[model samples]
Target chain A: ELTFGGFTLTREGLLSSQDKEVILSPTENKILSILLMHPKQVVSKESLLEKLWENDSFIDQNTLNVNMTRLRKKIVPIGFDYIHTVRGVGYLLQDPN
Target chain B: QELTFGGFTLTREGLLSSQDKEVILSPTENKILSILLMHPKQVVSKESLLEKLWENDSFIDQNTLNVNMTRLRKKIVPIGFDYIHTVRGVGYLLQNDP
Candidate 1:
């Protein structure tokens, strides 16, 4: 299990803190993993797409934006926003405390 | 040689970087940006871009290019910096002063 921002993520990609637990989808799991790997740092959109989809140019930029949006919404129930959109740049995952 | 414009450097494979950050351009966006970079400060017409991208396609809408342009801007243009500009009825230019 990995812990950051007061939330603990299980090996199976389950996130929990205090009494609330959130289940992340496959895409969300990978997105969060990337963010967690580099907490408090901005991860570029290009990096995410390249890492996730490899050389498949078939995946449009909008899809990555959508997944990021969904990942942000899913973690809202955790009581704080951990994911932030760094416009024209990338996404940042920061610990609230 | 890699292209550099307005503080950003683009590798031949479409990796655009500036200082500590970077953006990976899609194949289409890469082609578009590469064309504009080659002719900085000059307006590149939509027809010209379209032909180069699709090679005189059977049927590609002008709106398709518009969408791609918007997406490209979203990736390169920061809150305080502007890189791409659209001429009223022509096409796009890389520099603002053009």
Candidate 2:
């Protein structure tokens, strides 16, 4: 289990903070796993796509956008807004301190 | 319309849950799955999916549909447990077999 920004992401990829827990889809799990690998640093969309979908070239950018949006909604309600979008580039998971 | 099949329930607003397992879907994914549920175990043509889901949108091509379908399948997983089968040169369907 990995904990950051007051959230604990389990080996199974389930996320929880305090008493609230959130289930992540396979896609979300992979995305979050990648973000946590390089916390507080921007992980580009290209790299994310490559990691999430091996055949990334055929995947639409909108797919990534939507996944990110859903991921944000899931974690935001827990009061941690650690994921930040670096416009025209990618996203970063910060400590929010 | 809300629908249930293969031990799972897809709520009207696009939440897919099977007992304790739940997955939140995007609007596109929801529409695609809902349409498939509407005709359970039957194939839904890609052309029909585009017409029903993206009627008002422009530049909604085959690849776009493919992307949505792929993502939907990824979200609804356990291998062929919660499976959506692709009928080559046709479209997709939720398998009714074990």
Candidate 3:
């Protein structure tokens, strides 16, 4: 069981008791799915970028940050706050409980 | 369940218990904590972390590290969990405190 904030997310999507539903962009959805699949593990930033874009020829780092920032806002109100920054390392999804 | 690191306590749900009461980390901060916990005292290199945080296959701006780290440290400092130690030319260290 991956619990962030008040939501218990599975590999499928949000499983929270809260009434609100989270709307995710295509890119945000993909990123969340990856983190769900690897709960509590450190998923590299590069790996996420590759999976979200697939092509290295296009897309830049700022674009990814914009998407992530948007994604963060969407989930903040719901209490599913498990996303973390690892300095120069990467990002992780932790469910301490 | 709780984890005691440095002078702080991390609750099961990522809540930090310090003199200031229960403190919460943002999504990005939580992600960094999860990774550091996985290795405990091990130094997880910068190259490895960047590979995990993004969603596409491309090189990330090195400055991204500076931004995220600044954010993460700000959150953790209040809790007294200063586990994120810089290893100089190497990487970062997440000290293990039982």
Q: Residue B36 CA error for candidate 3 (Å)?
A: 0.4
User: How well is each residue in B1-98 modelled by candidate 3, as lDDT tens digits?
Assistant: 25565656654334556666556554444445666776688887877666654532223455866577777787776656666888886777887352
Tell me the alpha-carbon RMSD of every candidate.
14.8, 14.9, 17.6
| Better by DockQ, candidate 3 or 1 | 3
The DockQ ranking, best first, is 3, 2, 1
Residue B20 error, candidate 2, Å:
23
The 10-residue segment with the lowest total lDDT in model 3 chain B? B52-61
Residue B48, candidate 3: alpha-carbon lDDT: 64
- Name every residue pair that clashes in candidate 2: none
Per-model fnat list? 0.00, 0.00, 0.00
Best by lDDT: 2
Per-residue lDDT of model 3, residues A20-55, tens digit only: 656453456556766776777887778777766652
Stretches of candidate 1 off by over 4 Å are A1-97, B56-60, B79-81, B96-98
Please give the DockQ score of every candidate, comma-separated.
0.03, 0.03, 0.04
Query: What local distance difference test score does each model get?
Result: 0.72, 0.73, 0.62
Q: Which candidate should be chosen as best, given TM-score against the real structure? A: 2
